[PDB]
Amino acid sequence: VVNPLFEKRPKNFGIGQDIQPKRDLTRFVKWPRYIRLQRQRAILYKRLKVPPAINQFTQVLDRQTATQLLKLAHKYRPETKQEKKQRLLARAEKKAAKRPPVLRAGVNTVTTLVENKKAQLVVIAHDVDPIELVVFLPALCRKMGVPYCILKGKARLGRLVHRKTCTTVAFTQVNSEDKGALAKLVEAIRTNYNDRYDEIRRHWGGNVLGPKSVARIAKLEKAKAKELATKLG
Amino acid sequence: KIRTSPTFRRPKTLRLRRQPKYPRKSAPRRNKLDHYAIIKFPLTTESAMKKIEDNNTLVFIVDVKANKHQIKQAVKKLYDIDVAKVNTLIRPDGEKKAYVRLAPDYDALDVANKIGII
Amino acid sequence: GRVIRGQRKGAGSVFRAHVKHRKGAARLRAVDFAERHGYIKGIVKDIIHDPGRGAPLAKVVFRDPYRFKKRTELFIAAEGIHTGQFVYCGKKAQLNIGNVLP
Amino acid sequence: GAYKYIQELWRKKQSDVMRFLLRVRCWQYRQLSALHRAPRPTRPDKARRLGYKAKQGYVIYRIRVRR
RNA sequence: UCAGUCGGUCCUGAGAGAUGGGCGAGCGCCGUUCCGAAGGGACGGGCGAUGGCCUCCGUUGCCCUCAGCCGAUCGAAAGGG
RNA sequence: GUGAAGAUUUUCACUGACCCGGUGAGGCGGGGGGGCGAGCCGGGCUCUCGCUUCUGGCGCCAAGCGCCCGGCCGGCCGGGCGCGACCCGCUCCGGG
Ligand SMILES: [Mg+2]
Ligand SMILES: [Mg+2]
Ligand SMILES: [Mg+2]
Ligand SMILES: [Mg+2]
Numbered sequence: 001v002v003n004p005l006f007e008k009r010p011k012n013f014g015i016g017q018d019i020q021p022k023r024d025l026t027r028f029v030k031w032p033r034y035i036r037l038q039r040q041r042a043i044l045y046k047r048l049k050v051p052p053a054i055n056q057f058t059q060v061l062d063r064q065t066a067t068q069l070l071k072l073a074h075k076y077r078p079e080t081k082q083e084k085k086q087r088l089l090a091r092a093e094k095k096a097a098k099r100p101p102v103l104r105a106g107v108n109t110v111t112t113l114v115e116n117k118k119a120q121l122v123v124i125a126h127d128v129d130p131i132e133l134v135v136f137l138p139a140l141c142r143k144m145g146v147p148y149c150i151l152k153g154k155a156r157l158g159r160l161v162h163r164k165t166c167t168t169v170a171f172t173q174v175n176s177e178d179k180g181a182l183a184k185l186v187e188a189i190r191t192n193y194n195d196r197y198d199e200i201r202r203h204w205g206g207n208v209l210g211p212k213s214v215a216r217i218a219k220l221e222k223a224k225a226k227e228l229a230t231k232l233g
Numbered sequence: 234k235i236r237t238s239p240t241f242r243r244p245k246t247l248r249l250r251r252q253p254k255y256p257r258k259s260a261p262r263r264n265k266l267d268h269y270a271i272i273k274f275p276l277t278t279e280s281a282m283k284k285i286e287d288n289n290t291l292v293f294i295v296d297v298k299a300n301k302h303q304i305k306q307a308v309k310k311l312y313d314i315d316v317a318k319v320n321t322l323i324r325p326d327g328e329k330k331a332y333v334r335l336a337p338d339y340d341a342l343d344v345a346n347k348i349g350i351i
Numbered sequence: 352g353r354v355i356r357g358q359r360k361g362a363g364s365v366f367r368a369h370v371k372h373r374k375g376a377a378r379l380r381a382v383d384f385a386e387r388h389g390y391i392k393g394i395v396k397d398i399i400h401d402p403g404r405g406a407p408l409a410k411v412v413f414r415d416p417y418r419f420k421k422r423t424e425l426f427i428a429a430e431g432i433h434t435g436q437f438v439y440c441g442k443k444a445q446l447n448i449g450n451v452l453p
Numbered sequence: 454g455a456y457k458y459i460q461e462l463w464r465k466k467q468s469d470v471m472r473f474l475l476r477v478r479c480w481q482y483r484q485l486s487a488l489h490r491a492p493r494p495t496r497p498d499k500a501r502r503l504g505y506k507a508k509q510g511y512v513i514y515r516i517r518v519r520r
Numbered sequence: 521u522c523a524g525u526c527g528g529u530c531c532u533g534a535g536a537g538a539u540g541g542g543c544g545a546g547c548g549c550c551g552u553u554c555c556g557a558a559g560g561g562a563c564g565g566g567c568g569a570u571g572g573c574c575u576c577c578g579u580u581g582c583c584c585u586c587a588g589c590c591g592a593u594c595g596a597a598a599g600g601g
Numbered sequence: 602g603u604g605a606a607g608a609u610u611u612u613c614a615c616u617g618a619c620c621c622g623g624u625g626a627g628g629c630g631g632g633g634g635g636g637c638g639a640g641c642c643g644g645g646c647u648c649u650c651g652c653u654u655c656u657g658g659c660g661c662c663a664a665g666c667g668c669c670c671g672g673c674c675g676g677c678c679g680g681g682c683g684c685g686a687c688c689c690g691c692u693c694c695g696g697g
Contacts, residue, residue, distance in 0.1 A: 006665080007664075011686085014389075015652080016390065017652075017653050019417070019418065019661050020628080025627060028694085029239055031626090032557045033557085034557080039691085040691090129493075132459055135462065136458040211630060213630095218631095238588090243559080245559075323521090371533080382695080388651090416627090436657085439653095483618095
């Protein structure tokens with residue numbers, strides 16, 4: 001019932017025997033200089049001995065706690081321009097015929113309300129292009145006793161406010177029904193960051209070799225160790 | 234999707250056309266090279282008259298910026314006479330002398346004596 | 352004083368090499384997977400005299416393993432080679448006159 | 454105010470924290486061309502005290518000079 | 521002093537010369553493939569619009585797919601043409 | 602710049618700054634899988650290979666399999682995906 005003319009002719013992709021197929025070459029592409037630069041910069045970050053003051057941002061909050069924090073933060077979002085206009089219109093007509101607590105954005109605003117311990121929680125983005133903007137903030141919060149946590153993504157941190165990016169968001173006051181959840185989050189954040197600051201400042205980063213260098217060293221030490229211990233006894 | 238070629242080239246992007254909020258010039262420039270200024274004056278030399286009386290052609294003095302097609306169309310519109318061919322040269326004085334060979338039906342002698350040159 | 356001829360030879364004004372009639376630089380094929388693991392065979396199509404060069408050149412044509420084309424290259428001719436000879440280039444190429452191996 | 458901490462930190466260039474940033478920035482800028490535009494200033498506080506304001510119309514060009 | 525057919529106009533030789541880049545206080549200089557995201561193209565297929573006996577095709581607009589080149593450009597009225 | 606040894610210094614190391622070479626930056630480092638020899642009790646470890654050498658021919662734009670989807674009347678026409686062509690990685694490979 002099968003046509004006998006349907007044979008199979010397999011290609012033999014040997015050396016010098018057949019044309020090499022168009023396979024995946026995603027590793028050997030001569031990438032543009034900007035792509036090359038933004039990749040080897042991350043390589044250099046993993047290579048060089050990153051100081052603890054900078055590497056502290058690499059250690060970040062876990063996923064479940066992060067999304068729980070976002071759920072809490074979604075309650076106190078600031079007013080947009082249109083609804084702020086609506087509020088002003090409502091007050092104007094009400095007068096013709098109390099503000100709730102909200103988030104505290106901006107690094108300058110946050111550090112001013114932290115240095116006088118007027119805030120209960122601080123959330124810091126881990127991906128500021130200059131780290132010098134927020135490098136001192138974890139130490140400042142530790143000395144002032146204000147709980148602080150590090151969150152991955154300034155974009156998702158900046159989506160709490162209705163702008164593009166925001167370095168830091170501060171919780172200064174919460175409503176009664178969210179007081180318990182805020183306190184539960186605060187104690188866990190304090191244990192993660194504030195209570196382990198000595199280890200944080202003692203924890204350097206980077207100083208990791210590449211996979212080829214690790215492999216060659218590992219096989220070298222494996223060969224010498226297996227030729228030493230096994231034969232000796 | 235995967236990359237086959239080991240080289241990377243700029244992806245082709247979408248580019249739009251000009252939609253200015255105002256025309257750069259208020260009005261298009263008037264055609265200064267019209268059918269009246271393309272031809273200046275026919276020659277009245279004895280050689281020209283000997284040529285019109287033998288080869289059934291005409292001689293004109295025109296500007297240097299006129300093509301043979303433009304001369305043919307201008308003569309056709311100004312005098313309602315079919316043109317067989319045009320031969321143009323630039324005189325040492327600077328003006329362009331154009332020989333306009335007419336179609337066999339028309340007669341150069343009649344055209345010349347009805348446009349003035351005789 | 353006037354700058355000497357030895358100094359004037361570095362400016363490359365009239366002392367540049369005459370490289371018009373030269374057929375090209377005699378370079379071995381670039382190192383690739385074929386030579387690094389196996390071998391690639393080519394045919395000696397012709398042998399050419401390179402003007403201004405004391406050694407003859409041999410134009411060897413290989414088959415490109417990555418696309419359908421026939422690459423042509425010029426090697427320094429080793430005496431004993433001839434047109435129509437198969438020249439093998441790579442790690443696995445055996446030891447004989449003409450072949451090039453690491 | 455954040456800018457006070459920033460300028461105090463920048464005055465401590467010889468420390469390891471700033472030295473790592475300086476060498477990383479210096480290498481990255483060396484990889485780029487001699488004349489190019491940075492979308493945002495590298496030093497906000499220093500730009501502000503030099504007169505820069507974060508408003509449309511002010512741009513920053515990072516240029517390299519052979520020492 | 522009249523040209524499709526005679527030449528220039530086209531091509532490129534030795535060379536010259538921008539862009540990338542680098543240098544330079546600076547006018548600018550070096551450099552010609554080198555520290556480059558260097559393709560404005562296309563057999564074919566799909567989506568959508570127009571015209572003509574809306575048959576079939578053409579112009580398109582968008583997407584898929586394919587694509588090497590060697591460097592923009594100038595350089596001979598005795599070289600090729 | 603990062604380490605290990607000897608007494609701030611010397612030697613031996615690493616690359617990551619910096620330098621050179623190749624390319625159309627075309628198969629790099631490991632792991633897995635498939636054979637070829639050695640030595641133990643059908644099985645385990647180390648190591649090796651990875652398909653082309655009698656000749657001036659040809660070789661690209663996939664056959665084959667498996668799984669989905671469309672239109673038309675079990676049959677007809679026309680598509681998509683994966684293995685075929687192993688997986689994961691942080692520098693394109695090399696030499697300083
Ligand atoms: Mg004729
Ligand atoms: Mg120049
Ligand atoms: Mg020309
Ligand atoms: Mg000629």
